[PDB]
Coordinates of all heavy atoms in Angstrom, one line a residue:
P4 N 2.0 6.5 4.6 CA 1.6 7.9 5.0 C 2.8 8.8 5.3 O 2.7 10.0 5.3 CB 0.7 7.8 6.1 CG 0.8 6.4 6.7 CD 1.4 5.6 5.6
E5 N 4.0 8.2 5.7 CA 5.2 9.0 5.9 C 5.9 9.4 4.7 O 6.8 10.2 4.7 CB 6.1 8.2 6.8 CG 5.6 8.4 8.3 CD 6.4 7.7 9.3 OE1 6.3 6.4 9.4 OE2 7.2 8.4 10.0
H20 N -5.5 12.8 -3.5 CA -4.8 14.1 -3.5 C -5.6 15.0 -2.5 O -6.8 15.1 -2.6 CB -4.9 14.6 -4.9 CG -4.2 15.9 -5.1 ND1 -4.4 16.8 -6.2 CD2 -3.3 16.5 -4.4 CE1 -3.7 17.8 -6.1 NE2 -3.0 17.7 -5.0
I45 N -6.9 3.8 -11.7 CA -7.3 5.2 -11.5 C -8.8 5.3 -11.0 O -9.7 5.1 -11.7 CB -7.1 6.0 -12.8 CG1 -5.8 5.8 -13.4 CG2 -7.4 7.5 -12.5 CD1 -4.6 6.1 -12.6
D109 N 12.3 -3.2 -13.8 CA 13.3 -4.3 -14.0 C 14.7 -3.7 -13.6 O 15.3 -3.0 -14.3 CB 13.3 -4.7 -15.5 CG 14.2 -6.0 -15.7 OD1 15.1 -6.2 -14.9 OD2 13.9 -6.7 -16.7
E123 N 0.2 -5.5 -23.6 CA 1.6 -5.8 -23.2 C 2.3 -4.5 -22.9 O 2.2 -3.5 -23.6 CB 2.4 -6.6 -24.3 CG 2.0 -8.0 -24.4 CD 2.1 -8.8 -23.1 OE1 3.2 -9.0 -22.6 OE2 1.0 -9.3 -22.7
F128 N 11.4 3.6 -20.1 CA 12.7 4.2 -19.7 C 13.8 3.2 -19.7 O 13.5 2.0 -19.3 CB 12.5 4.8 -18.3 CG 11.5 5.9 -18.2 CD1 10.3 5.7 -17.5 CD2 11.8 7.2 -18.6 CE1 9.3 6.7 -17.4 CE2 10.8 8.2 -18.4 CZ 9.6 7.9 -17.8
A134 N 19.4 2.9 -6.9 CA 19.6 1.7 -6.1 C 18.3 1.1 -5.6 O 18.2 -0.1 -5.5 CB 20.6 1.9 -5.0
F142 N 0.5 14.2 -8.2 CA -0.5 15.0 -8.7 C 0.0 16.4 -8.9 O 0.5 17.0 -8.0 CB -1.7 15.0 -7.7 CG -2.2 13.7 -7.3 CD1 -2.0 13.2 -6.0 CD2 -2.9 12.9 -8.2 CE1 -2.5 11.9 -5.7 CE2 -3.4 11.7 -7.9 CZ -3.2 11.2 -6.6

Side-chain angles (χ1 to χ4, degrees):
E5 281 181 284
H20 184 197
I45 314 301
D109 189 337
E123 285 306 295
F128 301 104
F142 305 110

